[PDB]
């Protein structure tokens, strides 16, 4: 409830100050509140993440799916966090699903084609840039990267 | 004030359901009741960044900084977003401003590593992924960053 999203909103606003100790602090009191609260994991998981903690995040990301299974920002965001580590299939596996929720997630097919570019599939990647530009035209990132794609097969 | 903050909050909540538009349409309530909040102009350019929309962010990182030059983190942004569009030089420049106004901030570091990596200079990529490490030892980020320099070294 209101207090937990309180302390909540207090480990975001630490966190995106660089103070991670003080925000994971007031995120933890939010989840002794609350532990059901999906978003207050992932915002635990984001402070990981953003520390380059891939290991910790993952298990806060998990928590957070499992108590918000339909949220395509759960499993997008678990995909991410796969993709960084190197675990391109995995992190397919994430965004497939994420897509399959919200299939109007330009960012989500970008991530999706930069995994297939990463294990060398530039004619897949090519195709998620392309959805990718199609929803959002003004990504900067896909256009490069559709650009980068091309020359890579091309 | 708490009525511009309100606002900013009310596109964090969006933004987390990936409601980028509605984010976008609040974040700007938030600038018209307070034009002079440095931390909702850097809101704004986040939802841009992390859209790919890299053009409008550096627009909006550069309003923040304009109200708030001090701000390391939006120095960092800035120096993302010409990174992220392949422009190292720019990129080096607003992450060593960041890295002189909190040279405590591990991700300043790891980001400057990153840029050198990315423009060849190794040894000097090595020598900022350690300073990053012993600021934030758990960063497998750095650490997978630190071994590829390495790699690629010799």
């Known amino acids: 409830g209101h207090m937990a999203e309180a302390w909540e909103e207090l480990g975001e606003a630490y966190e995106k100050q660089g103070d991670y100790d003080e925000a994971i602090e007031y995120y933890q009191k939010a989840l002794e509140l609350d532990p059901r609260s999906a978003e207050a994991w992932e915002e635990l998981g984001e402070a990981y993440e953003k520390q380059g903690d891939y290991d910790e995040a993952i298990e806060y990301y998990q ?6 299974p339909r949220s395509a920002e759960a499993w997008e965001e678990l995909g991410e966090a796969y993709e960084k580590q190197g675990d391109y299939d ?4 994430y965004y497939q699903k994420a897509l399959e929720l919200d299939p109007r997630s330009a960012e989500a097919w970008e991530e999706l084609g930069e995994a297939y570019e990463k294990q060398g599939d530039y004619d897949e990647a090519i195709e998620y840039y392309q959805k990718a530009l199609e929803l959002d035209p003004r990504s900067a990132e896909a256009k490069q990267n559709l650009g980068n794609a091309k020359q890579k097969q091309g």
């Open 90 to 93: 995995e992190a397919i596996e």
């Open 63 to 68: 928590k957070a799916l499992e108590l918000d």
